[PDB]
Amino acid sequence: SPGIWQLDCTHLEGKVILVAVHVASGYIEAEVIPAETGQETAYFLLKLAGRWPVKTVHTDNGSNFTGATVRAACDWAGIKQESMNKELKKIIGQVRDQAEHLKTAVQMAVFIHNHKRGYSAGERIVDIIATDIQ
Amino acid sequence: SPGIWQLDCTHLEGKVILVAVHVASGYIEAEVIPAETGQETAYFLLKLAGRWPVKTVHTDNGSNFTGATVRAACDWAGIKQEESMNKELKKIIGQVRDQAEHLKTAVQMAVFIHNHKRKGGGYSAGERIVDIIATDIQ
Numbered sequence A: 001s002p003g004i005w006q007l008d009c010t011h012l013e014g015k016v017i018l019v020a021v022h023v024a025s026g027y028i029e030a031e032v033i034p035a036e037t038g039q040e041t042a043y044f045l046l047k048l049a050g051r052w053p054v055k056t057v058h059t060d061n062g063s064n065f066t067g068a069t070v071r072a073a074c075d076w077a078g079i080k081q082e083s084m085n086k087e088l089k090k091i092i093g094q095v096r097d098q099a100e101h102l103k104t105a106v107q108m109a110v111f112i113h114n115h116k117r118g119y120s121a122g123e124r125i126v127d128i129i130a131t132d133i134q
Numbered sequence B: 001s002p003g004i005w006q007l008d009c010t011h012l013e014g015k016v017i018l019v020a021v022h023v024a025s026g027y028i029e030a031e032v033i034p035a036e037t038g039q040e041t042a043y044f045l046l047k048l049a050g051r052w053p054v055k056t057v058h059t060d061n062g063s064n065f066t067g068a069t070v071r072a073a074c075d076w077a078g079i080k081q082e083e084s085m086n087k088e089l090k091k092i093i094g095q096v097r098d099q100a101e102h103l104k105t106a107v108q109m110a111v112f113i114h115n116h117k118r119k120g121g122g123y124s125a126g127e128r129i130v131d132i133i134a135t136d137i138q
């Protein structure tokens, strides 16, 4: 289902990474965030929803999802709350020494994951969404 | 062409916004950045290239593009470096500015609006970029 994403957190080097996976394709958007708070989570969700058609996000339903700010951002953006991640940590592992900062390593890992190839996750998400539009 | 993006800087409230436009569709990625430096520019380009198939970026060729860090990021990602948008984006930011404490939030609401706006049975920039890239793959 083309509008469905899963949002999870993962922790490395005392920092928090949010990883959104487009369920049908395995395409990922991920960011290091300063704290696992409602404000940062809402911001992440807003960014994601401005970039891809996000209809539903499956989350862990934890503390950062209970507050006014995340609720307001999902409402505004029209989002409902209703395998790649150990791989992501593995890729960050392989590129870590090339980056001074974890955030750079995370983005190199997103690039690798989304481009790795019959199709890449990047190719899959565009094919899925294009097909839906039709 | 499907892999061609234009990257420009916009200034508001003493802050720097980078705006990348997918030339063929008008779809945008934008973010407020700490400073208009090679390191932040390279980071932005890396992020962009990990999310869409970026082959060529047309930039203003200024100071933040001369250094080793941007050059290395473009090389790694396989990218070549070869007015109304940022005006309309500025206009939407103005429209939503009072709803957010932070400029960065207003910028992302503006990206959302710009990319989803259906200008008629027309298409949005979001629909257009996916249609273009899917067509190129097929």
Ligand SMILES: Cn1nc(-c2cc(Br)c3c(c2)OCO3)cc1N
Pocket: A114, A115, A116, A117, A120, A121, A122, A123, A125, A126, B049, B050, B051, B052, B053, B133
């Ligand atoms: C391996 N490969 N991957 C792509 C590709 C990569 C990313 Br990221 C994308 C995309 C297509 O559409 C949305 O994001 C194109 C080719 N040839």
Ligand SMILES: Cn1nc(-c2cc(Br)c3c(c2)OCO3)cc1N
Pocket: A049, A050, A051, A052, A053, A129, B115, B116, B117, B118, B123, B124, B125, B126, B127, B129, B130
């Ligand atoms: C108006 N409208 N816009 C979309 C839509 C919006 C965004 Br953002 C996208 C996208 C499609 O693919 C990549 O990013 C779907 C519909 N119905």
Ligand SMILES: [Cl-]
Pocket: A007, A008, A009, A036, A060, A062, A064
């Ligand atoms: Cl979370």
Ligand SMILES: [Cl-]
Pocket: B007, B008, B009, B036, B060, B062, B064
């Ligand atoms: Cl610039």
Ligand SMILES: [Mg+2]
Pocket: B007, B008, B009, B010, B059, B060
């Ligand atoms: Mg410029």
